[PDB]
Amino acid sequence: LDQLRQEAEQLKNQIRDARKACADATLSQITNNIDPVGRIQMRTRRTLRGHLAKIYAMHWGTDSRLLVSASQDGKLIIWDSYTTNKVHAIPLRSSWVMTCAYAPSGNYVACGGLDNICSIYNLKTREGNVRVSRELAGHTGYLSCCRFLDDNQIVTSSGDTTCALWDIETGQQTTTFTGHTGDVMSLSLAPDTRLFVSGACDASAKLWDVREGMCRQTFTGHESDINAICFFPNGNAFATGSDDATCRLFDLRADQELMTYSHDNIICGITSVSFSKSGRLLLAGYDDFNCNVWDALKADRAGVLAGHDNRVSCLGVTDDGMAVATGSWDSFLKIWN
Amino acid sequence: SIAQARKLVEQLKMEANIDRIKVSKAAADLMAYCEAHAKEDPLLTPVPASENPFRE
Amino acid sequence: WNEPPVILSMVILSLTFLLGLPGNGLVLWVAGLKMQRTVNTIWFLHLTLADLLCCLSLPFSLAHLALQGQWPYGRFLCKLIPSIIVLNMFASVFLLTAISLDRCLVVFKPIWCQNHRNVGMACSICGCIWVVAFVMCIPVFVYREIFTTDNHNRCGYKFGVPTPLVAITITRLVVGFLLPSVIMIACYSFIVFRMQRGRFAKSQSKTFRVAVVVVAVFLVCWTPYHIFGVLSLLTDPETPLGKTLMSWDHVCIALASANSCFNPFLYALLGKDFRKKARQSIQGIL
Amino acid sequence: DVQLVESGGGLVQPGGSRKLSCSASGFAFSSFGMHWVRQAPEKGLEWVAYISSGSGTIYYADTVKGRFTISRDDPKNTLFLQMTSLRSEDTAMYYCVRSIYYYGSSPFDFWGQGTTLTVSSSDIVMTQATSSVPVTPGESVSISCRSSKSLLHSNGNTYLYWFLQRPGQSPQLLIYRMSNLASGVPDRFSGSGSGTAFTLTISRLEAEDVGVYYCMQHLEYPLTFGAGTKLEL
Amino acid sequence: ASKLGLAR
Amino acid sequence: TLSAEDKAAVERSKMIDRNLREDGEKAAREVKLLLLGAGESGKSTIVKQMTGIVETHFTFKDLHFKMFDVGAQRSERKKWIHCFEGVTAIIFCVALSDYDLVNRMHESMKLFDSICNNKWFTDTSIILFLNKKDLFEEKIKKSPLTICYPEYAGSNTYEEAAAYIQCQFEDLNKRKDTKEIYTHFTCSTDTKNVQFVFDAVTDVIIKNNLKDCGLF
Secondary structure (H helix, E strand, O other): OHHHHHHHHHHHHHHHHHOOOOOOOOHHHHOOOOOOOOOOOOOEEEEEOOOOOOEEEEEEOOOOOEEEEEEOOOEEEEEEOOOOOEEEEEEOOOOOEEEEEEOOOOOEEEEEEOOOEEEEEEOOOOOOOOEEEEEEEOOOOOEEEEEEEEOOEEEEEEOOOOEEEEEOOOOEEEEEEOOOOOOEEEEEEOOOOOEEEEEEOOOEEEEEEOOOOOEEEEEEOOOOOEEEEEEOOOOOEEEEEEOOOOEEEEEOOOOEEEEEEOOOOOOOOEEEEEEOOOOOEEEEEEOOOOEEEEEOOOOOEEEEEOOOOOOEEEEEEOOOOOOEEEEEOOOOEEEEO | OHHHHHHHHHHHHHHHOOOOOOHHHHHHHHHHHHHHOHHHOOOOOOOOHHHOOOOX | OOOHHHHHHHHHHHHHHHHHHHHHHHHHHHHHHHOOOOHHHHHHHHHHHHHHHHHHOHHHHHHHHHOOOOOOOOOOOOOOHHHHHHHHHHHHHHHHOOOOHHHHHHHHOHHHHHHHOOHHHHHHHHHHHHHHHHHOOHHHHHHEOOEEEOOEEEOOEOOOOOHHHHHHHHHHHHHHHHHHHHHHHHHHHHHHHHOOOOOOOOOOOHHHHHOOOOOOHHHHHOHHHHHOOOOOOOOOOOOHHHHHHHHOHHHHHHHHHHHHHOHHHHHHOOOOHHHHHHHHHHHHHO | OOOEEEEOOEEEOOOOEEEEEEEEOOOOHHHOEEEEEEEOOOOOEEEEEEEOOOOOOEEEOOOOOOOEEEEEEHHHOEEEEEEEOOOHHHOEEEEEEEEOOOOOOOOOOEEOOOEEEEEOOOOOOEEOOOOEEEOOOOOOEEEEEEEOOOOEOOOOOEOEEEEEEOOOOOOEEEEEOOOEEOOOOOOOEEEEEEOOEEEEEEOOOOOOOOEEEEEEEOOOOOOEEOOOEEEEO | OOOOOOOO | OOOHHHHHHHHHHHHHHHHHHHHHHHOOOEEEEEEOOOOOOOHHHHHHHOOOOEOOEEEEOOEEEEEEEOOOOOOOHHHHHHHHOOOOEEEEEEEOOOOOOOOHHHHHHHHHHHHHOOOOOOOOEEEEEEEOHHHHHHHOOOOOHHHOOOOOOOOOOHHHHHHHHHHHHHOOOOOOOOOOEEEEOOOOOOOOHHHHHHHHHHHHHHHHHHHHOOOX
């Protein structure tokens, strides 16, 4: 028994040495001569005033105009950002909701939470209403994230330390990803939707392969739980947000950490992470009731988004990069620009 | 937990056999991407109010 | 200028304006835009609306009092500018008495209030209060008119002891003072007496300290106004006793109007959520 | 199965009164606004009335305002048109049309089946200059419609609609807002054009495409139709 | 004739 | 300056707003009770006398109760416990016969300490049930309570032993100026537990409404 336990330890030490010989220079030295972005002032442009409880998730449509939000009052609401109008209001069977997704084609939305079930809703019906298209069951822990690949596939992340890839037309798990040791709290699909990353409560992140269902790489370094994760727009790096009040930038090809986004004035954890269209600004939401803007390439702090009266729980940036939306534990969303 | 232990060792062998590049090379690629798309970032370089869908 | 009965009137009335407009104005911003729709906000919106409209109308009393009776503000405005005054004061009184019957109903019928007390009832009742406060204004508008003596305009009454005069005063005392101040002492006595006697009693002292500083500001602001509205029905205005009453009449209205500057503090800015929203709004602006 | 069935027509004396009914079945009737559209015995379509969802908004044409009254009964899924003092110019066939408005919706997408009424004896002008064209199967033809005012609004939308009425049938939506293709319509139909000049293009024309094509504007009430272009052979 | 106050 | 189609959208949005407000009032007249307990608390029992999450709606004397049971959640409590911040009360079940099994009472005491002084339930009243009192008063005359509480001083009689256990549980409430604990020795397997929950909930409701507008 200990022979395998010893071999696993020395093999782990070999990896740590192998990826140390590749760290000849840091990102700070390389980007030590470029001009800083300066100071970023973002004014609030809209405020969405429909929910009656805490808002837990949101997602943008690929047309950069519609978005869906979920709150614990049991409603999904689809907003029109430009006019602030409400397009749809969907009543959920269970009000314990913690995730939300919008299909890339725009025909469906997804939802899930403490009921261990992911529900697919059909938006474009001949009868004029919104119907539950499918209910996916099989997870033994709460649903914490879900993301569409296309109209027939979806990846879900659960609190039973597993991720799964479904088939909506049939309702079965095509593949199961079983590597983690704690609850999996976040999820992010690559730009080409060929592979994805997940962050769990064992203070590690893993890089999965959708086609073969195996773990490629494991990234460590955080001292506590991981709550948020996001790919760089290039598709060759990603960022994580943790409860130790620190964001980190990992690199797939170099296979270790690059930057740490921390300061002595922040002591609260991160709830959400997102990039800008160019990959130059990193936006992070905190429990301080406000969002921070980081110069992702120099680790400076460039601005603040302080307009909320409670914790900021979700955060997203449009596909054309024109705006940022933040939901919070008060019942308001805000569009910043 | 012999079966579980043998599984963890098998996973680590796949981890070690990956190929890696230098950080200075991989850091320069993030810089190059950020500089080639600087003009297409409305949040970085604010657009005038004429073509801003949100006004207000 | 002189006769400190009048001098004190400007002093009391001006500090009402200085401390009143910032107070009620702040409540309107916090309650009307920042917070959600609850039954509590409906009461506080209308109470501050009636108070602010009373607050905005103080300097007209300053204008009338400064010129010492002369009324150059027209010939029709000595029919409506007092009717605006009376509506705002006596809608406050009926709004204070509806926040005493609502607190007593929560403690007395808790299960009924859980199922049937919503924003619909709050708006419906608040509507009827304005209508009732409007009816009491009719006798003022009908009988007010303008006298002209010594080239100085006099904003007097064209009565015809005038029988309509007695009717206006008595209905302004029975309704307005006696009825609102019995519903307000009896509703704040049941609350204190019930939150001391039960199988889950707490034995605290916050309820008693708040239910006494609320029914004592009211009974000291509005009591001189009604006493100095009856001694004018039964005293000759030529006796030195009679005219000394007239000189001090001005401060009595000043006290009643001063009640508008305390309502935002005793009712709205007394909870915890409303105060927290107040600091957050103030810190954000600063 | 989204059918709208309607009845109440017949022969009525001039100066009389009548009531028409539209009983819906198979969709969320409460969420759709409803229209009445009139089509004279040998003429083009003509808008009549409109009632919103929740009955909070009602519009009438100038020809019928004061005489007609539109109402709905949501619990029973029924649409009514109460109409009084009928002239000889009201003889026509009446259609029941559903339409729902949100961002990206498709108004006027389903039409009723028609009940015939016979009675015994500024507005935007939409122009369709051509009256009839002979068409050979397998070819391509274009139909033009012209407006007297710019249909392009400040928000970027051009409110032009194209309908097709096959012989002895109800009109069918083809294109909404000048470019979008209604669901269930083959891809060989396409629409284009700028303000005050529009065109409908059909490629590889074949059978079941003959009929009359109408262009309607939805920029402002009252809604107005074109005279219609007929494809034969 | 009267020298009343406003509200009064 | 809006279009003809652009105004029907606003009308639809206003109707959606109206329905949202109307639905937010039907859900504000119900009492929400989170139902915690030890490992062998007896959640099924608490259901009988009175996948993921399990709900239960019932009605007593024109009051509507929703009772959430979270015994099936095997995940980490600190990730989903903030979802229940805002319930009216918490029902905590403790078995009085679990002072000899293995120690087992100390786990319940630790769980009560964790829940009571949690940063989310800082002003949520707790209703404490002490079940199985018949077994407790039958076993107490064959096994001294000093097994679970060495520092005991009283005698092996049910009347004072039960009071000592209740005091030990109630002493774990640190902030005795914002939270109240209602204790009930549930037994007789009849309609005396629903009545106690009803009384405690009306008291909680009255005090909450008073606390909102100063007064407390």
